[PDB]
């Protein structure tokens, strides 16, 4: 029974990824009740390109052995996966709509990350650095779809290069944190930038929602210095002082937006 | 069986590729009905040098089991390092028959290459990003020795120099194909590069072949423009406009070999 | 019995240490008299966190079979990154009753290198090189947190001053041993330094104890020509002048410490 | 049986040699008829530094199969291993009985250079590359010690110098192929130094045997020659045009001293 495992993991250690699942399936058929063998398919599967077996396999290694934290790891990096190559042609969409070839080549670049980072979870799925660094980069291609549709929704040049401007350095902390990923300041900072594009997008929507010419004045301000303090705590992750100046303008963000 | 088949990945993982093909054999001994072994034994022995052995496992692997499509990947890929082989031959051959010594150095410095691109997909054979890379390298070596084989049959010093400075490009985007591999940008590259020779080599053999001044004069004129722009495409790969310009021009030669 | 303990292996092999800890505890439930069995638990539960689990399983291979000498190294590898991470304690406590942002930096500094080699070492456990570079690298720290605890308990800034400038180019050379494990001239660089250190530390102790301004002073004096050899011995390790001459320091620190 | 074999791999695998060659013992103890067990049990006590048990293993592996090259392939690595330290041993000597400090640090550096290549050879010890590498290496620095013996049988201060600068340029030849294994252009350029300086040191001591001033000028005139075009082609490795000029001047030095 275990054998076969061994040789799977043995095809595995050779980059015979393909021999690897076949060995892993011949184990599974001679045992199916080895929580260990449907694991370690539904891995090496995601490997593959293959995302609906990896998912079969996640599930019914979960099925067999709920306890296994393991399988419900891959489990939601599978879900991660497709969450992200979800956001991405939602993200490829708006740029077709939005017909500008800087928001195109920008989502194009996202796409290529967010599948980056994908391959490096994939061939790293425990280490938890790499899950949660891609679960903020899925955050932020979610904040910036989100962004996309805004700006579409609003149609303004001004706020079309506000949102233009937010997803530059959306994907450019994302880059960030896909290259140095065992670093828990650019981590915080991944953090505190994704906040603080959940609450600009939020104050231009509910500038957009009210519709007057002061507010909307207002919206362009607070986003504009957010954009700026964004990019300075970018520059400079590592200094509290910048990291405390991000959670004020969020707070202020918040503030006002529940004002208004 | 299956014990003396994890004794040989091991020695395999180990750099020990003498010991693995023996624990291959003595596997496929205890029980010659293993597929997967024949497969692993030829896949190492490949690395050995015997690509005669490497030749008749893959054999075995598919007569014993045709649905295995990774001993069609080897057996092909044996098949693919055998013809490259002859093309290096043939273009030594070619180089010496002309005793140039930079057509003889750049034959050189291309079979070195294809050594090296052999090498690599031999350590990772289930990758079918360097298969079609070297694939792509075996018909760039293929199409040099075309023409090679047409600058023998002309005489010329002028389409000598040209077919000189077509290898040299040649040699040049099958450097950065093999340096790059996994990167579709230089892969669409090559395609268009090695689509534009065998176009430039067509329409010099119909020049050479009608043998008129005129037309001959206007074949230089398109292989120095195809020259001209493959080096730009080579130096900028990810411009669609360079792109479409090299399929123009490869267009046009193309309807003029067809007119003449 | 075995065949858990291959799969174990091979798991730690693929980065998925925590089903290879999981496979060796069921090896050890099929048979708990594998004393290779608890080793390898040890040592791969050493890289996962639990720390208590490892000495656990190191004690048991030790008490099953006393000749294994490699438990008893990650035993003491064990027992080492307990008084590192206690030694880093008392430093963080220390810099943090002195308040100076300095010390406090520096402290996580050295925190930080000494949780790299220890990570180092886990991941190579049975290199006696790694072992006694992190080795001299915890009497470095414990030499540290003295010289911390006797400045605090002098309390004049002059041999804070001091105090500070030795911790400096002790985390320095720390960096420098880490960096380069397995260069016999940074290892004599490091023990000649740490012998420097302690010489230091136990000369202004005496100082502070006898409580003179002339013996106070020649006490700066005898640390600051220290700290300057001790810098000039770092930038320039392979000098034996310079190693002999540290030596030659250090044995008038002693005999002038023996004489007051 | 061949269970533990797998095992000792494994465990070779991660490192842990030690543990390794018990597994590899223990495995033997099961079956001693394993030419397998010994030959990789030898193979992992070499990189131990327990040469003594390799060589026994080497031995009995060899005895209980003649046919395996690759016991006999560690066996002379083993042999090489030992004749490389003797050499070193031996220039040592020499260079202290010289007392001249450079001629010291040349020996110094030699032996760091010799032992460093027999680490990598110990690592990859079936590749071919490395180990006629090594095979060159080894007659370099027999033919360094050779011609310290020379050196130290003249006396001269001219020929000691002369013997400074051969082994001056034979260290270097030896550090590049040390670094460029797999490059047979500085395999070629090893061969042919270490060619030239057995022709040096033979000319040299004919010509210390013949004590004649004019045959003394002579011997250093063709030895500057032969250290002049040394450097040019160890600087210049890829020139047949050099190639050929050393060997022309080796011939010549040939030619000389069979007619003295």
């Known amino acids: 029974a275990s054998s076969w495992v061994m040789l799977g993991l043995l095809l595995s250690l050779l980059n015979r990824l393909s021999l690897a699942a076949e060995a892993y399936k011949k184990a599974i058929e001679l045992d199916p ?3 260990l063998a449907w694991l370690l398919l539904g891995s090496v599967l995601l490997l593959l390109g293959r995302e609906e077996e990896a ?5 019914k290694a979960i099925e067999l052995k709920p306890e296994m934290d393991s399988a419900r790891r891959l489990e939601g990096i599978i879900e ?6 979800e956001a991405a042609e939602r993200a490829q969409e708006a740029a077709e ?11 194009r670049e996202l796409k290529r990350l967010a599948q980056e980072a994908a391959e490096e979870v994939r061939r790293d799925p425990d ?4 899950n949660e660094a891609l679960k903020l980069i899925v955050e932020a291609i979610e904040a910036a ?6 700006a579409e929704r609003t149609g303004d040049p001004e706020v079309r290069e506000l949102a233009r401007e937010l997803v530059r350095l959306a994907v450019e902390a994302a880059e960030e944190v896909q290259r140095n990923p065992s670093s828990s300041d650019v981590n915080e900072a991944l953090k505190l930038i994704v906040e603080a594009i959940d609450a600009a997008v939020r104050a231009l929507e509910a500038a957009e929602k009210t519709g007057d010419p002061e507010v909307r004045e207002l919206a362009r301000e607070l986003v504009r210095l957010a954009v700026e ?7 400079n992750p590592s200094s509290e002082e910048v990291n405390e100046a991000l959670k004020d303008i969020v707070k202020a963000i918040q503030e ?3 004002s208004l």
Chains 1, 2, 3, 4 share one sequence.
Do not use: F
């Open 33 to 35: 009740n080895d929580a």
């Open 55 to 59: 998912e079969e396999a996640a599930r």
């Open 80 to 85: 991660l996966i497709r969450r992200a190559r």
């Open 97 to 107: 709509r939005t017909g500008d070839p800087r928001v195109r080549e920008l989502a």
């Open 127 to 130: 280490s938890k650095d790499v």
């Open 145 to 150: 779809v989100r962004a996309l549709e805004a």
């Open 229 to 235: 303090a964004a990019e300075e705590v970018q520059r």
């Open 256 to 258: 006002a937006v529940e």
